[PDB]
Design a protein around this ligand. Structure first.
Ligand code: NA
Ligand SMILES: [Zn+2]
Ligand SMILES: [Zn+2]
Ligand SMILES: [Zn+2]
Length: 235
């Protein structure tokens, strides 16, 4: 029942409840002449909500806020962007105008500024070096090292065993490398292994784009990334 790319008109946002107090948000965007889906996370935070990632642009993010109020009815009070690309920070200004406190690591904030992308307000401490983890409300933020980008964070919800990999993790249907312009292809498998070693208890794994699955999304991603490094597509 997870919504697929052809099931979400561009400009609309769907929510999917993964576990008690955990939802993903799903939006779509035109990119490279195709239409791509994109996931973020919503985590219940007492009587408030913690948002992970925007919905890829101002229009989608406004629709995300409206859909959250329609379906959940609790206020989004904080948001964390997991890397500097537009599918993660595009819409930060909308969140800020809606009273959401926006956060990213210093590295993400700097890279967003260099790229010309929206810059989250707050700087997350303690995520500078590969292997660093910090608790942030009801989630753990983890910097596994460079992968899809040098700044990419992953997010674990310990109460629900939900691992949100962001764009460092590919859905199973993705057979080839996606947007790797800013990626560290050489470190990506090592970074995935750090994720596997830290969260072997994860029951649900949410990629940055596409269908959730289990922990075999990690090995699938390593396989695809390694094939790309070797100028190969297998699947
Ligand atoms: Na709180
Ligand atoms: Zn990206
Ligand atoms: Zn992405
Ligand atoms: Zn595979």
């Amino acid at each position: 029942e997870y919504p697929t790319v052809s099931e979400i008109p561009v400009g609309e946002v769907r929510l999917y409840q993964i576990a008690d107090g955990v939802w993903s948000h799903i939006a779509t965007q035109s990119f490279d002449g195709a239409v791509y889906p994109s996931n973020g996370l919503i985590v219940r935070d007492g009587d408030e909500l913690l948002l992970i990632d925007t919905a890829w642009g101002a229009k989608n993010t406004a629709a995300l806020l409206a859909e959250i109020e329609k379906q959940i009815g609790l206020p989004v009070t904080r948001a964390v962007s997991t890397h500097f690309h537009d599918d993660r920070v595009g819409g930060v200004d909308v969140l800020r105008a809606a009273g959401v406190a926006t956060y990213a690591s210093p590295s993400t904030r700097r890279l967003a500024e260099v790229e010309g992308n929206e810059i989250p307000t707050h700087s997350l401490e303690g995520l500078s070096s590969s292997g660093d983890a910090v608790r942030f409300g009801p989630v753990e933020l983890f910097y596994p090292g460079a992968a899809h980008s040098t700044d990419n964070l992953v997010v674990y919800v310990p109460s629900a065993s939900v691992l949100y990999g962001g764009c460092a993790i590919y859905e199973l249907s993705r057979t080839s490398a996606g947007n790797v312009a800013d990626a560290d292809l050489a470190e990506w498998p090592t970074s995935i292994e750090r994720i596997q070693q830290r969260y072997p208890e994860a029951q649900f794994v949410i990629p940055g784009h596409g269908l959730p699955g289990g922990l075999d999304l990690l090995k699938h991603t390593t396989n695809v990334v390694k094939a790309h490094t070797n100028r190969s597509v297998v699947e």
